[PDB]
Write a protein that binds this ligand. Structure first.
Ligand SMILES: FC(F)(F)c1ccc(OC2CCNCC2)nc1
Ligand SMILES: [Cl-]
Ligand SMILES: [Mn+2]
Ligand SMILES: [Zn+2]
Ligand SMILES: [Zn+2]
Length: 453
């Protein structure tokens, strides 16, 4: 009745030995956590990263948020940290007529789900969300300014979210294109009820979230295997969310009661993330939540070797949806292959397998377009073109292995799945533009094998 909290997601308390290597640890808990989509990680009691900031010199531009269930919000779009904190505490204090920390978390949760489902209430809140910048930096130590001995100890921690993307078992650790959205941490300043709508990460990546300080962040998570179930429920109740969008900056997302999902047989788990704790989201695991009060979090995307095959599947799914890519998965694979001699050996082995599938798929595609009567061809360094100059006109995929052009429509490309979609000219007028021949690729494949042994 009213709100039934979902069951608790898994909570892990690794020893320092377990904890020291984030990638080994994540791989370890994966059979458990991937069944629940999210999990919480409590670091060893003495892992205590130093937090320090001047609340008067940190500025940011707030986003405003209406709180209505099923209402469309867009994924992306001046306070000091102090003036925001004052506004945030006053809001929670006045809303509940209580001291801001005496408000029970159970109560804030039940109240959140009441207020979002009521048309009459028009509660609006504000929050901060931006990548690390010079005007507002990471909450973790970074090199620059003389650091304290305590800060230096955490500079190279695997769990320092600045390091995670560039560590050795990370797969995005070598991507050329400056995907600032996916290897840089994001900073989040929350207040009571400010919420993150249901979503999955770009390219179905992992995310790792650290709550540096403040009141808890409440999470709901859904395991990856249930992603399409959830989408079907949402399509049915809010179809306006699923119309086509002109770019990445136009994704539509919404607040939705997890009990609604649970009624439709979608497994949902919850947690309250407190200061000093990590939440990890797994590939294609839907998640949402809201902040209990004034707080400060930091989060980053990442991709492990476990993720690589899912990344390929995600881009295929993006193609089916005519959804824009953040980067080319094939380009990332080939970039790594080209650096095989310095790859971690397990990484080399995993990349080799994805590359084999890529090559077999590419062979079949090239044979198909040849049979359609595309004969002329020319090598092309796709990686040099801005993304918006190499997207398939039909399905918006970022091209890299190959594409079709026609002199009839200068600058336009289709991927090889959409050869019929470029123009009315006969295919013999087309050119196949390709990055590699088979012969270019097999030394790269062999290098990976040698590195992998
Ligand atoms: F996977 C690549 F290496 F890119 C690749 C794959 C296939 C290809 O052409 C095939 C298919 C058409 N006949 C010759 C072999 N050329 C290059
Ligand atoms: Cl409302
Ligand atoms: Mn997320
Ligand atoms: Zn296409
Ligand atoms: Zn043409």
């Amino acid at each position: 009745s009213m709100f039934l909290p979902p069951p608790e997601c898994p909570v892990f308390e690794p020893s320092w030995e377990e904890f020291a290597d984030p990638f080994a640890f994540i791989h370890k808990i994966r059979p458990i956590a991937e069944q629940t989509g999210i999990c919480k990680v409590r670091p060893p009691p003495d892992w205590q990263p130093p937090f320090a900031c001047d609340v008067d010199k940190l500025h940011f531009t707030p986003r405003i948020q209406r709180l209505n269930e099923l209402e469309a919000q867009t994924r992306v779009k001046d306070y000091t940290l102090r003036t925001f904190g004052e506004m945030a505490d006053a809001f929670k204090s006045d809303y509940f007529n209580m001291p801001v920390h005496m408000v029970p978390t159970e109560l804030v949760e039940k109240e959140f789900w009441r207020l979002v489902s009521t048309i009459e209430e028009d509660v609006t809140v504000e929050y901060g969300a931006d990548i690390a910048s010079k005007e507002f930096g990471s909450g973790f130590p970074v090199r620059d300014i003389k650091l304290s001995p305590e800060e230096e100890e955490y500079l190279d921690s695997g769990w320092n979210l600045n390091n995670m993307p560039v560590m050795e078992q990370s797969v995005l650790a070598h991507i050329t294109a400056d995907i600032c959205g996916m290897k840089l941490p994001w900073l989040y300043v929350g207040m009571c009820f400010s919420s993150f709508c249901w979503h999955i990460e770009d390219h179905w990546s992992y995310s790792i979230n650290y709550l540096h300080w403040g009141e808890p962040k409440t999470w709901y998570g859904v395991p990856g295997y249930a992603a399409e179930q959830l989408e079907n429920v949402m399509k049915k109740l809010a179809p306006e969310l699923f119309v086509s969008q002109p770019d990445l900056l136009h994704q539509l997302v919404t607040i939705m009661n997890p009990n609604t999902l649970m009624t439709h047989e979608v497994p949902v788990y919850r947690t309250n993330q407190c200061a000093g704790e990590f939440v990890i989201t797994f590939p294609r695991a839907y998640h949402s939540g809201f902040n209990q009060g004034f707080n400060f979090a930091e989060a980053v995307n990442f991709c492990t070797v476990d993720w690589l095959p899912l990344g390929r599947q995600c881009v295929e799914h993006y193609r089916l949806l005519h959804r824009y890519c953040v980067f080319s998965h094939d380009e990332m694979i080939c970039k790594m292959a080209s650096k095989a001699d310095v790859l971690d050996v397990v990484v080399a082995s995993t990349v080799q397998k994805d590359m084999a599938i890529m090559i077999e798929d590419e062979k079949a595609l090239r044979e198909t377009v040849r049979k359609l009567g595309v004969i002329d061809s020319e090598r092309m360094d796709f990686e040099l073109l801005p993304d918006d100059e190499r997207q398939c006109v039909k399905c918006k995929t970022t091209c890299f292995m190959s594409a079709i052009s026609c002199s009839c429509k200068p600058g336009l490309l289709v991927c090889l799945h959409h050869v019929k979609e470029l123009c009315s000219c006969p295919p013999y007028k087309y050119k196949l533009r390709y990055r590699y021949t088979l012969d270019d690729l097999y030394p790269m494949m062999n290098a990976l094998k040698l590195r992998a042994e």
